[PDB]
Design a protein around this motif. Structure first.
Motif, short mmCIF file in Angstrom:
data_model
loop_
_atom_site.label_atom_id
_atom_site.label_comp_id
_atom_site.label_asym_id
_atom_site.label_seq_id
_atom_site.Cartn_x
_atom_site.Cartn_y
_atom_site.Cartn_z
N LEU A 44 46.42 43.72 51.18
CA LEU A 44 47.31 42.63 50.53
C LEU A 44 48.78 42.97 50.35
O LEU A 44 49.47 41.90 50.71
CB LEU A 44 46.73 42.58 48.90
N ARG A 45 49.32 44.41 50.30
CA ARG A 45 50.54 44.47 50.50
C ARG A 45 51.21 43.93 51.85
O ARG A 45 52.22 43.59 52.08
CB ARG A 45 50.98 46.05 50.28
N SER A 46 50.42 44.18 52.90
CA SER A 46 50.69 43.73 54.31
C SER A 46 50.95 42.15 54.46
O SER A 46 51.40 41.74 55.42
CB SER A 46 49.98 44.37 55.46
N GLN A 47 50.59 41.49 53.28
CA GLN A 47 50.76 39.99 53.31
C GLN A 47 51.30 39.50 52.18
O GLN A 47 51.40 38.50 51.51
CB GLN A 47 49.21 39.24 53.55
N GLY A 48 52.02 40.51 51.44
CA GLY A 48 52.92 40.08 50.55
C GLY A 48 52.24 39.89 49.00
O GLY A 48 52.90 38.92 48.27
N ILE A 49 51.25 40.53 48.71
CA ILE A 49 50.37 40.35 47.70
C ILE A 49 50.20 41.60 46.92
O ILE A 49 49.97 42.42 47.53
CB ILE A 49 48.83 39.48 47.82
N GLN A 50 50.28 41.54 45.60
CA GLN A 50 50.07 42.58 44.84
C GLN A 50 48.65 42.32 43.66
O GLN A 50 48.44 41.10 43.40
CB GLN A 50 50.79 42.89 43.53
N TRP A 51 47.45 43.22 44.13
CA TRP A 51 46.41 43.03 43.25
C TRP A 51 46.11 44.15 42.19
O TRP A 51 46.63 45.32 42.38
CB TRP A 51 45.22 43.02 44.27
N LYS A 52 45.26 43.65 41.25
CA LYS A 52 44.71 44.68 40.15
C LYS A 52 43.51 44.06 39.60
O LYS A 52 43.97 42.98 39.33
CB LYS A 52 45.93 45.36 39.31
N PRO A 53 42.67 44.69 38.90
CA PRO A 53 41.67 44.14 38.25
C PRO A 53 42.09 43.27 36.91
O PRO A 53 41.94 41.90 37.00
CB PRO A 53 40.56 45.14 37.99
N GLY A 54 42.77 44.00 35.96
CA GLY A 54 43.21 42.98 34.97
C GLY A 54 42.59 43.64 33.61
O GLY A 54 41.50 43.42 33.21
#
Lengths: 97, 97
Positions: B87-97
């Protein structure tokens, strides 16, 4: 429609619930989720029975032992179905997303 | 912080991705997720090697065989970490929440 393929979403949903939020889990539900989760992901119960004095660990192990023999995909389906039924019993509808 | 405990959330997130959404998965990535997912949830690769003319089934089995010996929790962690880095390599940050 929902299948065992949604087991991970259901696990993530349960993990995401806050301590005192709209969804309440009684001991029975927590033991059902724990034992089906372990059966789904590890198969049959591992190791020796905890000491009776460890009543929570023993209850968890016994609940898992009560699932021995269940196929992994059947445990996944049962976990999802139980989440769906529990949420309905609290006036909540869920789907992945 | 994130750990193997978020494996289910990462899996559910990947399943949620639409065909032509913000996140793109190349074949390498699909094979990494598949092989780590199988290793994490089933352990070492099962059965016989598919026929070569079945290029995708063969590639998937081979990718899983390359994970043989990997502890299930280490596979889970590797899956989560791979999603975070993809995701970082496509400009996205993720986390469950």
């Amino acid at each position: 429609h929902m299948s065992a393929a949604d087991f991970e979403a259901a696990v993530a949903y349960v993990r995401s619930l806050p301590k005192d939020g709209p969804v309440q889990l009684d001991n029975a539900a927590k033991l059902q989720f724990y034992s089906l989760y372990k059966q789904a992901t590890e198969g049959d119960v591992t190791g020796s029975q905890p000491w009776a004095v460890q009543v929570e660990a023993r209850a968890k192990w016994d609940a898992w032992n009560s699932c021995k023999g269940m196929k992994s995909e059947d445990a996944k389906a049962a976990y999802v179905r139980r989440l769906l039924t529990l949420l309905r019993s609290q006036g909540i509808q869920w789907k992945p997303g």
